[PDB]
Amino acid sequence: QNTVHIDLSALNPELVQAVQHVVIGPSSLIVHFNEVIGRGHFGCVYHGTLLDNDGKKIHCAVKSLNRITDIGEVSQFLTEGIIMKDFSHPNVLSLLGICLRSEGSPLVVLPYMKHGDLRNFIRNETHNPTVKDLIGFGLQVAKGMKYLASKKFVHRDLAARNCMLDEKFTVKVADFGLARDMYDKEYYSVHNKLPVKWMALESLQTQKFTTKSDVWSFGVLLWELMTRGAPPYPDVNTFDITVYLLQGRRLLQPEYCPDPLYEVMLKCWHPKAEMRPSFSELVSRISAIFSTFIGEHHHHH
Numbered sequence: 001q002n003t004v005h006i007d008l009s010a011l012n013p014e015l016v017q018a019v020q021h022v023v024i025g026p027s028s029l030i031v032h033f034n035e036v037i038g039r040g041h042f043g044c045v046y047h048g049t050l051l052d053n054d055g056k057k058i059h060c061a062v063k064s065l066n067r068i069t070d071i072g073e074v075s076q077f078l079t080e081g082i083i084m085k086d087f088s089h090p091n092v093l094s095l096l097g098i099c100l101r102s103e104g105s106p107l108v109v110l111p112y113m114k115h116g117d118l119r120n121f122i123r124n125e126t127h128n129p130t131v132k133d134l135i136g137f138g139l140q141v142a143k144g145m146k147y148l149a150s151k152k153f154v155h156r157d158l159a160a161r162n163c164m165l166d167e168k169f170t171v172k173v174a175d176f177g178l179a180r181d182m183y184d185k186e187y188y189s190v191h192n193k194l195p196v197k198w199m200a201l202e203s204l205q206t207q208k209f210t211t212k213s214d215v216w217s218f219g220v221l222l223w224e225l226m227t228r229g230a231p232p233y234p235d236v237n238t239f240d241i242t243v244y245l246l247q248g249r250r251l252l253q254p255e256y257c258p259d260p261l262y263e264v265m266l267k268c269w270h271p272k273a274e275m276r277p278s279f280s281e282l283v284s285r286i287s288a289i290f291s292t293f294i295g296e297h298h299h300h301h
């Protein structure tokens with residue numbers, strides 16, 4: 001399995017051409033394969049060492065595929081690396097490069113995020129973020145999402161688990177495993193495991209995803225923030241969620257969440273997609289709530 005050989009000819013030429021101009025030479029990368037830092041659908045994430053244009057040791061995160069059975073898995077994995085190549089926004093994680101050696105899985109090289117994932121960070125009783133800190137994290141995610149939507153990319157997997165915090169406490173949308181280019185169509189329909197509890201009503205029904213269905217997921221992400229990383233609908237099973245939402249039942253107000261912030265969450269979960277605020281409107285509304293909330297804080301958002 002470490003001896004897997006990828007036939008580049010079986011992949012789309014545009015993708016190989018795309019991977020070619022972001023390729024990291026195998027000599028420039030040290031994967032700390034005995035140091036797992038993240039886990040997802042695709043595989044594991046490892047502590048890594050990148051040697052820059054000169055020779056300075058850059059600390060990084062290395063994504064790898066777990067069990068490579070088919071070429072489609074490789075094609076999907078390389079597509080996520082490609083989607084990230086042109087990202088340039090402080091609230092979006094950038095691509096350092098792709099290492100594709102003679103044997104083994106391709107490696108997606110990413111900048112190392114010191115404090116790890118947003119969900120675990122907010123659940124940690126040593127970090128203890130204030131109500132204002134949590135709002136600030138929400139604002140940062142909204143900004144990143146405004147940028148991704150303006151580039152016509154639909155995330156489809158927005159959750160606190162998929163966001164990371166660097167050394168300066170800057171929140172970044174980090175995982176792009178389910179992300180898809182909308183091109184000009186203003187949507188994405190499944191063709192080829194989805195996170196049900198963060199999905200918009202219309203997406204559970206029609207399998208179609210948009211910026212407005214990402215807005216729904218942002219609302220859930222906001223709820224996770226204010227509850228300090230609690231699972232949504234814990235007493236509702238995955239399979240019953242569609243009926244539960246058609247009946248008009250939503251996630252209830254967290255114990256220390258301001259009234260206008262919960263009002264924003266409810267707007268994100270509006271049954272009619274057109275009615276939901278845009279990410280532009282969310283940035284402005286959350287910015288106003290943040291700046292007018294006078295409570296203790298630490299970080300800069």
Ligand SMILES: CN(C[C@@H]1COCCO1)S(=O)(=O)Nc1ccc2ccc3ncc(-c4cnn(C5CCNCC5)c4)cc3c(=O)c2c1
Pocket residue numbers: 037038039040041044045061110111112113114115116117161162163164174175
């Ligand atoms: C969302 N997933 C992570 C999930 C989150 O839920 C838990 C399982 O992994 S996933 O693996 O699918 N995608 C990604 C996507 C990008 C990254 C990028 C950078 C990254 N940087 C630091 C840390 C780190 C990890 N820990 N630390 C610090 C180490 C010292 N203690 C404080 C945290 C830094 C972990 C990561 C990652 O694993 C990572 C993971």
